[PDB]
Amino acid sequence: AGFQLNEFSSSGLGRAYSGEGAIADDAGNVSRNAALITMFDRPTFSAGAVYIDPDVNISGTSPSGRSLKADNIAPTAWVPNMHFVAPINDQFGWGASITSNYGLATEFNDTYAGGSVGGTTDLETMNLNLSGAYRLNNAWSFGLGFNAVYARAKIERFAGDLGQLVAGQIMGQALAATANGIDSNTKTAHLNGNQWGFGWNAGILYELDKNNRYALTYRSEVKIDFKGNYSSDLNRAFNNYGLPIPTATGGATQSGYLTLNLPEMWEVSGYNRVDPQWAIHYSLAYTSWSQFQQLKATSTSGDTLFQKHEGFKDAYRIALGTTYYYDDNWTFRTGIAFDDSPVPAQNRSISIPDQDRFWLSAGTTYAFNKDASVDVGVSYMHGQSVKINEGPYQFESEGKAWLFGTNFNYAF
Ligand SMILES: CCCCCCCCCCCC[N+](C)(C)[O-]
Ligand SMILES: CCCCCCCCCCCC[N+](C)(C)[O-]
């Protein structure tokens, strides 16, 4: 999925996030399917983080004749996570979890010649969840949850070398020599803002027996109405001449309004304890990116200041993986998973460098005694190399990523 993230559990990172919401070895999953809450007999707690280490690269040459090579344009990332699960009654349970389901970080140098389309793009998301569940009979459980998302975002763009490109094409003369005076790192657009968003989630859990069980779950859409600073160092004169360029302010910071839709996600999952020391778990996540059509930043007067058309479309994430319950102490796991890109080639962009991803993964849990247990997980996910045609340039891009992750567990 585009700029989506599934690292709520390092326990689950070991399995390619397969069967999640269906598995429940640790408190880690009640945030995935707040139905699992019914699975715990006592207060359980989990905490840790996932180090995401990408390696995305851009390659290509611009008509001006300057490289559009961009080495490692996706910073590392420390995505933490905390969850709590406790029983209220022999029929009700609640829980809370701090996790991040959405984020990005595609950061180009301020002097990249393709600057207009590859500046900086950040998006941090914190999702505080509070949900509860109730068990009808020994077969199914129902759960509803409330999320207060806190998003932090910031978009920047610059005049690539467009200047010299424009100033060339025009070969009203000083009108050229001037746009040749513009430098590579000219704040062509700056946006930023901190805002809260709200959403809900529900999950159903039909469990055939203590060793087999399935689940259907939903995470609502989540809109974020940003009200933040916006500006463009280009001269106001550059305006109203039909250019696709973004509204100029000459340095002036004008209040800006933008809205970010955070795709709903449907997920079906299954978990089986086939053998005393083996269990298999698969899932099929559906993330509706159709909800994320564009990025439009408006003024107080509702007029457009910035607007990039994304046009993503619904996508999915299939996942298969297993766990090897060696013994009271040692536990292992591995999984494969494949998730489809929302971005249709013809919209693909170096900003949201995205292509179909393949998941290979392996993990391990050591439990010192009954209450404690540490989790360690490794995941490597490669993907397809694709051609990107944006604005006046034609880039090429490739992406591979490593993700390591620890997590501690404890139950009273
Ligand atoms: C503050 C968060 C920064 C996020 C860094 C983005 C890394 C994107 C790399 C693809 C990883 C996607 N995955 C694992 C979440 O599914
Ligand atoms: C003013 C804050 C706006 C929030 C920024 C949200 C960015 C989501 C990532 C979409 C990538 C940006 N894009 C379309 C310009 O390439």
From Swiss-Prot:
One of its GO terms (cellular component) is cell outer membrane. GO terms for biological process: long-chain fatty acid transport. Induction: By long-chain fatty acids. Expression of fadL is under the control of the FadR repressor. The lineage of its organism: Bacteria, Pseudomonadati, Pseudomonadota, Gammaproteobacteria, Enterobacterales. Has been isolated from outer membrane preparation as a homodimer. This is Long-chain fatty acid transport protein. It comes from Escherichia coli (strain K12). Keywords: Cell outer membrane, Lipid transport, Membrane, Signal, Transmembrane, Transmembrane beta strand, Transport. Belongs to the OmpP1/FadL family. PANTHER family: LONG-CHAIN FATTY ACID TRANSPORT PROTEIN, OUTER MEMBRANE PROTEIN NMB0088-RELATED. It is found in: Cell outer membrane. Coiled coil: none annotated. Its main location: membrane. One of its GO terms (molecular function) is long-chain fatty acid transporting porin activity. InterPro entries: OMPP1/FadL/TodX. Involved in translocation of long-chain fatty acids across the outer membrane. It is a receptor for the bacteriophage T2. FadL may form a specific channel. It comes from the Bacteria. It is a multi-pass membrane protein. It holds the Pfam family Toluene_X.
